[PDB]
Structures are given as C-alpha cells and as structure tokens.
Structure 1
Amino acid sequence: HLSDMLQQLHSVNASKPSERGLVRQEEAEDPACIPIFWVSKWVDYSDKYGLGYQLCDNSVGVLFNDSTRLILYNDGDSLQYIERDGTESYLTVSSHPNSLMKKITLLKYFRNYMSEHLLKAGANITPREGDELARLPYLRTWFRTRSAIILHLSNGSVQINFFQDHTKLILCPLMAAVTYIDEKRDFRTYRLSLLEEYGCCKELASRLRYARTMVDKLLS
C-alpha cells in the first residue's frame, strides 16, 4: 500500500494546505484513526548486525543486515523468524534451531539495551488491551537521511522521525491518516483528506512534503 500512501500524500500536498485563508487543522483530527503500532525506540547497529527496534506494545524486533528478521512478542519468549523471501516461522527464545543461536543472542542484547535505555515514543497513549499475540507487524525496510530515520512496517505504515527537533510522523495508508508527534510530545491523528479540506499549519505541511519524498525513496 505504499502506492496508496503516495497517492494520499501527493493529493494533500497538491492542495497546498498551509495556504488556506483560515487554517482549521483541528477539524481534521480523528481519534478513531489512531495507529495501533508504531516504533517507540530504535538502535542502529547496522555497521555490524542490523537495526533493532521496539514497538509501542513493548515487543522487539531486529532487521538483520542479511534481510531476515526476528520478532519477539511482548510475553518475552514467543518468537517469529522471517526469512529473506518472507517465509515465517514460530518458535520461542527457549526452543529454537541451533542455526538461529547467534541471531537470538543479538536479539537478546538489543532487547536488553532497549529495556534499560531510551524513552518510549508515544508513551502518553494508553497501552493497548487486546490480543498480545495477534500477528505483529515487522520492519520491512528502513533507511536514514541527514534529517530523519524512515521505518516501513509490514502493515503498510511509514514512520518518519526527525532527528533535530524530535518531531515524528506515523502514516497509515489504510486509515489514510497521519499522526503528528510535535516537539512537546502532543500526539494527534489527522485524516489526510480532511487536511485537504481544512488546511494545516506550515510545520505539518512541510513534514508532509518531506514524507512524500521519503515514500518515493521507499518505492524505488
């Protein structure tokens, strides 16, 4: 659904939302569109191993340099491994093929580090009560620019964290929504089509222009 996201972003950006005579950004908020998952922490150890991350439900994952993934559910033992071609298997930290020993050790180190360091993005949002073993999205791909880290999840979401001012976007093409986390850590979800109708501030508009450039990079 990256193509859908590109359509949604092209459309809002073509509407020049920060040039509305009267910007009514608030009218575009829709709390029912709040994302279920986003990346709360991340660790770039890609010079040797991969990109470790935590989702907001406290699950962990690693996208290894060889394009395989381990997903540790928030029960601390249940595990999914995703091979390069996307083949999925289920196991536990406690019972795993010997061939996965090194990757599991790496997972444990990333998990330990993010258990002990760093803040959780979105910590103000209520922890979800739901099925903690329902299939988790995983990190499909990521990259960094000078300004941001771009994280693309398997549920179609794209998250962009800006390094300098700590602002963040979580874009969902299924809800056709963007969640903006601002410098004060206010977390608000907007329908993109309503940003077209009602406008938005220049800060959000600028970030949505950058977002489109990033989605283009993901599609390339």
Structure 2
Amino acid sequence: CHLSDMLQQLHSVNASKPSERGLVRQEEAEDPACIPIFWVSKWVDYSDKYGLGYQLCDNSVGVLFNDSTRLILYNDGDSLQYIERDGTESYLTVSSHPNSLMKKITLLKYFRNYMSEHLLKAGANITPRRLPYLRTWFRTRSAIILHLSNGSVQINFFQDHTKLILCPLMAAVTYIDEKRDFRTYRLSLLEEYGCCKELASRLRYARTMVDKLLSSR
C-alpha cells in the first residue's frame, strides 16, 4: 500500500502545526524534484451500474467494473492490461477484437469517450517528473479519495476544486489551488518552514482520509 508510511508522514506534518507559526515561509518548502509522474486527471462514478472510470495524466484510461475486475487502456490507444479478481494480469489489444472481453472493452470506450467530450483535464499545466491503476477509492460529501497502486493518494475537493497529490515515496505533497496553480512541497520542509491555513487544514483532512483507507481494510 505504502499507506502506513503516508499516515506517519501526515501525522508528523500535522503534529508540527505548520500554520501556527510567527513567520511562514511556504515557498522555501518547494521541491521540483518531487513533482509526481502520475495523477488522475478525469473520473466518472457510475459504480451503481457500470463502474468507476478514470483517466491518468498520460492520457491512459482505466475502469473498475463492479465484479472487482479492472481494465486499462494505455495511451497508445490499443494496448490493454486486464486485471482479474485474483490479481492475475494479462495483455491484450483492442485491434485484435478479443473474443473474451469485447463487452468490457466497449464499456471502457464509452467511459473514454465520455471523459474526452465532457471533462476538464486536471493538472494539464503540470509537467511530470510502470503505469499505476486505481487500487481503492471512495466519495464523501466534500471530496473523492483516490488511492493509486504506486502508493499515491489523490484527494479532489468538490466545492472549490482544490486538489492534493500525496506521494509516500518522495514524502511529498502537490497542492493545486482554486486558480489551478500548483506547487510541490517536501513534507519535512513544510514541518520546518510552515504553510498557510488553507494547505494545513487540507492536510488534516488528508490524514483522516488515509486513516479511513487503512481502517476499511
């Protein structure tokens, strides 16, 4: 998961109370070497009938079907990775029109086309630094929480469109504000230099959400 590590990193950053300082030097916590490679740019929750479909920033698409299987289309528009209930992975292609999986491939195309003609690409202004899939997700009233197979946890806030991309490997957070401006901070440096109340409260909620992910296991 890498989730336990993220919890500890978030516990530590929140413990330092970064917004409760005389002087706050948020800019000094910025680290461009820690910019994420992957994040979810688009998603669609039709899980009550079809499943959850998503797009990653590299333009690859994925669908979590209700039978707990997953299908991903790579950004070459043809290569597929199909993950079964038991975690068995297999390679197929759209162009081969595979007997077994046409119905699921067609559903993915529906998702793909919907996201393409309806939805904004999140973090389109970010240049990034094995392809991950969506391992776990849930929605609250305030946000959607997206746990990727590379350890990343993404949190999209509904009301103001602000977003957090948390990486436990870099021990880093990327924050996208309401004006689509993005920064990448090393968490240990946020402990040292501090941050605004806006980022601080979102990191507090993030910890609750990681606690939730870990407790739902």
84-93 or 173-182, which deviates more? 84-93
Aligned-residue identity in percent: 100
TM-score between the two structures when normalised by the length of structure 2: 0.95
Whole-Å separation in 2 of the counterparts to 1:60 and 1:32: 26
Partner of 2:19, secondary structure, is helix
2:213 alignment partner in structure 1? 218
Whole-Å separation in 2 of the counterparts to 1:85 and 1:208: 34
**Cα RMSD between the aligned structures?**
1.2
Gaps of 5+ in 2: none
1:207 alignment partner in structure 2? 202
Q: Residue by residue, what CA displacement relative to the aligned partner does 1:140-166 show, whole Å, maximum 9, x if unpaired?
A: 010000000000000000000000000
Shift of 1:116: 1.2
Whole-Å separation in 2 of the counterparts to 1:142 and 1:95: 31
Cα contact 1:28–1:194 (8 A) shared by 2: yes
Q: Residue by residue, what CA displacement relative to the aligned partner does 1:34-91 show, whole Å, maximum 9, x if unpaired?
A: 0000000001111101110000010000111122111100010001001122211111
Whole-Å separation in 2 of the counterparts to 1:157 and 1:198: 24
Q: Residue by residue, what CA displacement relative to the aligned partner does 1:177-217 show, whole Å, maximum 9, x if unpaired?
A: 00000000011100011100111100000000000010011
Shift of 1:95: 2.5
Alignment: residue pair count? 213
Whole-Å separation in 2 of the counterparts to 1:52 and 1:211: 23
TM-score between the two structures when normalised by the length of structure 1: 0.94
Gaps of 5+ in 1: 129-134
In structure 2, relative to structure 1, the CA distance for the partners of 1:127 and 1:32 (3 Å cut) is: closer
Whole-Å separation in 2 of the counterparts to 1:53 and 1:180: 20
Shift of 1:113: 1.0
Shift of 1:21: 1.1
Partner of 1:206, secondary structure, is helix
